[PDB]
Design a protein around this ligand. Structure first.
Ligand code: 99P
Ligand code: NAG
Ligand code: NA
Ligand code: NA
Lengths: 10, 251, 27
């Protein structure tokens, strides 16, 4: 359901 | 939030979303109290009856948000956790007494039109504003109904309730570290926090200096927006000496 | 210092649509 976030943050 | 409305842009710039890294999902609300410190409910991080015990690296904080699910490019900011601090006398076994925790960010967040800290009350603003009948404001991306989810941040204004009415509404033992809020059945109007609003702020705008203060933290309720039930909030001022001790100790 | 003063509201002397409901309850 959530738009993926930038990989940087993961 | 049940029976609330969409927030305006920038209406709650201290609102924080607690976000699980994998699977990517909302965990809780929270609030920004300085460029490095975030306030939430302890049960957002530690609740053994539900096998919940998160560590810093399990989590992210998303600040400046409006949309629940979208990645709000050039507006929200996402930060990693340096350390979690739970109140040492948080009572997860019984009644969520002292339901409060702090999160220190790895790096300071940049303030903007959408990102700005809330004040914490001093003794006098608390004594003046924490009165039955006085209204505060609760915000969150939690469920719209007890038994779905909002497109954007929701807001509801709710009156503080007399402590005997709080006590008489429930079989759980309430303590001085809690207050309750919400309309009575005979009041016509309704509204409540619900699942997913946990950890978000209950704020009041002081009429003395026109600043917003965080008086409570979404802690617990029995159902959402049920007639004759009330939402319970952590009493931030009563636990402020702990807050200060942590921030003074750990930066 | 600047806590609790929202850039898009208090800092520009704009009110949100329901803050007055809070003020009116502070009797
Ligand atoms: N429904 C429980 C009631 C309770 C159980 C055990 C101790 C104290 C209270 C609750 O609110 N819980 C169980 C533990 C987490 C918390 C919760 O869901 N809080 C979020 C919430 C739920 C419902 C309404 N408003 C806020
Ligand atoms: C929570 O986890 C921390 C680290 O995993 C651990 O020290 C504690 O035993 C767990 N249970 C608690 C904190 O009640
Ligand atoms: Na009771
Ligand atoms: Na109710």
């Amino acid at each position: 359901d959530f738009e993926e976030i930038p990989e940087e943050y993961l | 939030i049940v029976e609330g409305s969409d927030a305006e842009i920038g209406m709650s710039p201290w609102q924080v979303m607690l976000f699980r890294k994998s699977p990517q999902e909302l965990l809780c609300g929270a609030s920004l109290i300085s460029d490095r410190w975030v306030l939430t409910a302890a049960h957002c991080l530690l609740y053994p009856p539900w096998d919940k015990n998160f560590t810093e690296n399990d989590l992210l904080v998303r600040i400046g948000k409006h949309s629940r699910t979208r990645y709000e490019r050039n507006i929200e900011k996402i930060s990693m956790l340096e350390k979690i601090y739970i109140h040492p006398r948080y009572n997860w076994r019984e009644n969520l007494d002292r339901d409060i925790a702090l999160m220190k960010l790895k790096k300071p967040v940049a303030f903007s039109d959408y990102i700005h800290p809330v004040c914490l009350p001093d003794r006098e603003t608390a004594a003046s504003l924490l009165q039955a009948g006085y209204k505060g404001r609760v915000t969150g991306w939690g469920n719209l109904k007890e038994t779905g989810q909002p497109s954007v941040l929701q807001v509801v204004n709710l009156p503080i309730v007399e402590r005997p009415v709080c006590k008489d509404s429930t079989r759980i033992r309430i303590t001085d570290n809690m207050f309750c809020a919400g309309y009575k059945p005979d009041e016509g109007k309704r509204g409540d926090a619900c699942e997913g609003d946990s950890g978000g702020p209950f704020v009041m705008k002081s009429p003395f200096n026109n600043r917003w203060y965080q008086m409570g933290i979404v802690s617990w309720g029995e159902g959402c927006d049920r007639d004759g039930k009330y939402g319970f909030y952590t009493h931030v001022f009563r636990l402020k000496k702990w807050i200060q001790k942590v921030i003074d100790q750990f930066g | 210092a600047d806590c609790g003063l929202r850039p898009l509201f208090e800092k520009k002397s704009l009110e949100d649509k329901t803050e007055r409901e809070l003020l009116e309850s502070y009797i």
